[PDB]
UniProtKB/Swiss-Prot annotation, chain B:
NCBIfam families: tim. It is found in: Cytoplasm. Pathway: Carbohydrate degradation; glycolysis; D-glyceraldehyde 3-phosphate from glycerone phosphate: step 1/1; Carbohydrate biosynthesis; gluconeogenesis. The gene is TPI1. Substrate binds at residues 8, 10. Its EC number is 5.3.1.1, 4.2.3.3. Homodimer. This is Triosephosphate isomerase. The active site is at 92 (electrophile), 162 (proton acceptor). The keyword Lyase applies.
Length: 239, 243
């Protein structure tokens, strides 16, 4: 009935077989809370390797995908390929995709619909840039990105929303509370009550506990710390 | 100049189907005078190098321009070497025109891949509107310049010409030879006599088992980058185009 706590780790463009095998060994052997759903996001070239080595209780996610099952798109991968090597999640609309590589709201929305129809779970990312926060348009910007995702979700049971400020715990709580209120008016009261909303700003072993105690924060998407031993402490943030 | 044939699988395959393709290639009679390379999706690169005969090379279909960092969704040359592949394809028409990759970015990628010890298949080519305006030469010389400014040792580079414009139109073998001959004249003078004589220039338009023998007889065509036919059994015939 209550929302289950969710922690993803985004490795970004880091690692080789030796270093990543060492990271996986540590997670497999650690004591992880039974009440946390854990997911690891690997570089595409190491996704098969990661699924082979990680304990089955831990999920594996691609860091990006395209919007059809096959075709003339040199350099891309599809949801069919991701299922084929046994991973169940994909991260979509990450700030680095939007702002370094120029991916639009429309494209991201199409990726979301296809991934879900193909039987993947989706971690959908939204967030405002520095110039946007300074202009006072935080809410308008994130509502806009959220609507472009929701118009492409027929069933919310396998969707998790991730808020990243691209640039305190009380400021995070304020944005999470308003996002849930959006789900209530524009979708339904039931969808608002059951959907996980995780925080994707800077998360470390030092700040994870206070963030996790906020009423509308359901977990994290972790960056640089997902490559270190302190990732274990972040998974156990509520204990 | 040793004959060179690459096969670009693009976004196609799963473990079953690509496994079958590799088995066919391992068991075929392939000319000893052809250098062969297979370009796999990133998610299957390690798999492909494990399964393919060591005489056949493996290429990534794209990479980025530093060894590590905050670039969600990307891979580096260090990662490609780590799983045992020796090549990368850079500046493919689909990267340029569907995903918007600039000449400046492609040039930075070429310099990094070569410094890190990979070979590079560098792609150039004009669009249909450019062909109609009569500016084919101007476009490919501009693209080739942005590559050459970033190359020190040409023994590790192969240049691929793609007529994007034709791929509902057709490109003839004489038309391919005319472009290849001009590209070599560019190299003679902007680099050296020795580099023009020794660098392979391969054709990346539509290659099938039916047209490969006439294309391979041209004086300045050194081989191919194959698309859809790299996924079929006739890829073997293309490797053997000079017999």
């Amino acid at each position: 009935a209550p929302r289950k706590f969710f922690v993803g780790g985004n490795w970004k463009m880091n690692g080789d077989k030796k270093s990543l095998g060492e990271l996986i060994h540590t997670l497999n052997g650690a004591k992880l809370s039974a009440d946390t759903e854990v997911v690891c996001g690997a570089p595409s070239i190491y996704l098969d390797f990661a699924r082979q080595k990680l304990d089955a209780k831990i999920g594996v996610a691609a860091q990006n995908c395209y919007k059809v099952p096959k075709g003339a798109f040199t350099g891309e991968i599809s949801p069919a390929m991701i299922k084929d090597i046994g991973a169940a999640w994909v991260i979509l609309g990450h700030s680095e995709r939007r702002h370094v590589f120029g991916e639009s709201d429309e494209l991201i929305g199409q990726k979301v619909a296809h991934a879900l129809a193909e039987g993947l779970g989706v971690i959908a990312c939204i967030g405002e840039k520095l110039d946007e926060r300074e202009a006072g348009i935080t809410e308008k910007v994130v509502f806009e990105q959220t609507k472009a995702i929701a118009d492409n979700v027929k069933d919310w049971s396998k969707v998790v929303l991730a808020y990243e400020p691209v640039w305190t715990p009380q400021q995070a709580q304020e944005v999470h509370e308003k996002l849930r209120g959006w789900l209530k008016s524009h979708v339904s009261d039931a969808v608002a009550q059951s959907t996980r909303i995780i925080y994707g700003g800077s998360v470390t072993g030092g700040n994870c506990k206070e963030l996790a105690s906020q009423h509308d924060v359901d977990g994290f998407l972790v960056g640089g710390a997902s490559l270190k031993p302190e990732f274990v402490d972040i998974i156990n943030a509520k204990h």
